[PDB]
Amino acid sequence: PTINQLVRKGREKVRKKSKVPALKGAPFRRGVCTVVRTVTPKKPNSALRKVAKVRLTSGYEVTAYIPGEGHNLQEHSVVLIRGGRVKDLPGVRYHIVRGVYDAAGVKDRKKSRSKYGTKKP
């Protein structure tokens, strides 16, 4: 565009979109589990991925992934959720934090224990 056109109209800035709107600007959110189940991933992966339906303190109700091998979550469990989507699961945008509230740490975990919330043996 010409200089006069830039003076008349300018350049439009770029507005970013939040990928974790249910967090409402917080790093983490507490919630209560309503449904715990397994879901199947999209092509090409094949598995039974453990997820929870979580009703949060911020008013939203979302789906969160449960990482690690084995878990103790069930209906009415209190959990903490953090950002981060699971690529191969449709509509899953959040991760349950292991080792907080009613979500126990991963048993017999020996590597990368700060994730999965396992104490030093």
Residues that bind another protein (CB under 8 A): 40, 46-48
Q: From Mg ion, RNA, another protein, none, which one binds at residue 98 (CB under 5 to 8 Å depending on kind)? A: none
Q: Is residue 51 a contact partner of residue 90, using CB atoms and an 8 Å limit?
A: no
Residues in Cβ contact with 30 at an 8 Å cutoff, skipping those fewer than 6 apart: 56, 57, 78, 79, 80, 81, 101
Nearer to another protein, 34 or 40 (CB): 40
Nearer to another protein, 3 or 48 (CB): 48
Q: Cα separation of 36 and 77, whole Å?
A: 10
CB of 43 vs Mg ion, minimal distance in Å: 9
Nearer to another protein, 89 or 103 (CB): 89
Which of 109-118 are b and which e, b meaning 16 or more Cβ less than 10 Å from the residue's Cβ?
beeeeebbbb
Contact residues: RNA, CB under 7 A:
1, 6, 11-14, 16-21, 23, 25-28, 38, 41-50, 67-70, 82-91, 108-115, 120
Amino acid of residue 79? V
Contact pattern for Mg ion over residues 39 through 78, marking x by CB under 5 A? -----xx---------------------------------
Q: Is residue 70 a contact partner of residue 107, using CB atoms and an 8 Å limit?
A: yes
Positions that interact with Mg ion (CB under 5 A): 2, 44-45, 112
